[PDB]
């Protein structure tokens, strides 16, 4: 039971970490889209 | 010029979709972790 528990925690932390990384990716891509629209 | 715009929009939307999907995975894993904690 304890072993399964550290695995759940360690993996959940990895998912939260990728969410942050993906959020930043969207923000960056969102900005790149704004500049392209105004480059018009 | 027109092409790059739809590509950005299309890909940004795809990132938002993965964010939502990972959000949902996180909730499911957070819940599984709570149930394990109660089994202790």
């Amino acid at each position, epitope marked *: 039971l304890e*072993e*399964e528990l550290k*695995q759940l925690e*360690e*993996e959940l932390q*990895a998912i939260e*970490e*990728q969410l942050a990384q993906l959020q930043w990716k969207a923000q960056a891509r969102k900005e790149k889209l704004a500049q392209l629209k105004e480059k018009l | 010029l027109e092409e790059e715009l739809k590509q950005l929009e299309e890909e940004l939307q795809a990132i938002e979709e993965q964010l939502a*999907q990972l959000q949902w995975k996180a909730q499911a894993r957070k819940e599984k972790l709570a149930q394990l904690k109660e089994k202790l």
Partner: nanobody
Amino acid sequence: QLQESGGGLVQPGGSLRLSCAASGSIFSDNDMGWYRQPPGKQREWVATITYDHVTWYADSVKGRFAISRDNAKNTVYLQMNDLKPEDTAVYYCNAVPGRRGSWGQGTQVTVSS
């Protein structure tokens, strides 16, 4: 009923591709993952892959390992690049909430010079 293969002995900086043959009961439609047991330590989660190929990885291997799956063959793969001695462990595959009951034999992986 998990059977991993592909491990072995490799030098720092090397490559390895591990394979996991899954039962189809364990595999089909479920998240699959790699775990490892380093010497003197506890079995730790390493990477996860969903049925539709969304991936995530532990901090210690992110950017060096890449997990993949073959849904036709019920097989899961772990491509290990830029290997470091810390990566020395016995590697096991399973469904992401690992089945307490069923662990295959694993596959030994050694990194050193």
